[PDB]
Curated annotation (Swiss-Prot):
It is found in: Nucleus; Cytoplasm. Methylated by PRMT1, in an insulin-dependent manner. The PRMT1-mediated methylation regulates tyrosine phosphorylation. The modification N6-acetyllysine is found at residue 68. Identified in a IGF2BP1-dependent mRNP granule complex containing untranslated mRNAs. Part of a complex associated with the FOS mCRD domain and consisting of PABPC1, PAIP1, CSDE1/UNR and SYNCRIP. Interacts with IGF2BP2. Interacts with GTPBP1. Interacts with EIF4G1; the interaction requires RNA. Interacts with EIF3B and RPS3. There is a cross-link at residue 32 (Glycyl lysine isopeptide (Lys-Gly) (interchain with G-Cter in SUMO2)). Binds with high affinity to RNA molecules that contain AU-rich elements (AREs) found within the 3'-UTR of many proto-oncogenes and cytokine mRNAs. Also binds to double- and single-stranded DNA sequences in a specific manner and functions a transcription factor. Each of the RNA-binding domains specifically can bind solely to a single-stranded non-monotonous 5'-UUAG-3' sequence and also weaker to the single-stranded 5'-TTAGGG-3' telomeric DNA repeat. Binds RNA oligonucleotides with 5'-UUAGGG-3' repeats more tightly than the telomeric single-stranded DNA 5'-TTAGGG-3' repeats. Residues 1-75 form the RRM domain. This is Heterogeneous nuclear ribonucleoprotein D0. The modification Phosphothreonine is found at residue 30. It comes from Homo sapiens (Human). The modification N6-methyllysine is found at residue 22.
């Protein structure tokens, strides 16, 4: 699992999970940016299915989803 900081107030587990589907497989992907439930924490989480897939997305944190970069970490 990992932590992705810098999610857009209108992000979702789909656009973030798919954006991360290019690194490997994902069993989970949360997004704390609820623009409707006032539950937007400004970041979400990502949970890949394999270790090699996680290390890859961590090889370069110069990401850019929702039109904004993020902060990938080991949760």
């Amino acid at each position: 699992k990992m932590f992705i900081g810098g999610l857009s107030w209108d992000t979702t587990k789909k656009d973030l999970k798919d954006y991360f589907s290019k690194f490997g497989e994902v069993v989970d992907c949360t997004l704390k940016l609820d623009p409707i439930t006032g539950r937007s924490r400004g970041f979400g989480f990502v949970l890949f299915k394999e270790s090699e897939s996680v290390d890859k997305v961590m090889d370069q944190k110069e990401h850019k989803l929702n039109g904004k970069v993020i902060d990938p970490k080991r949760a």
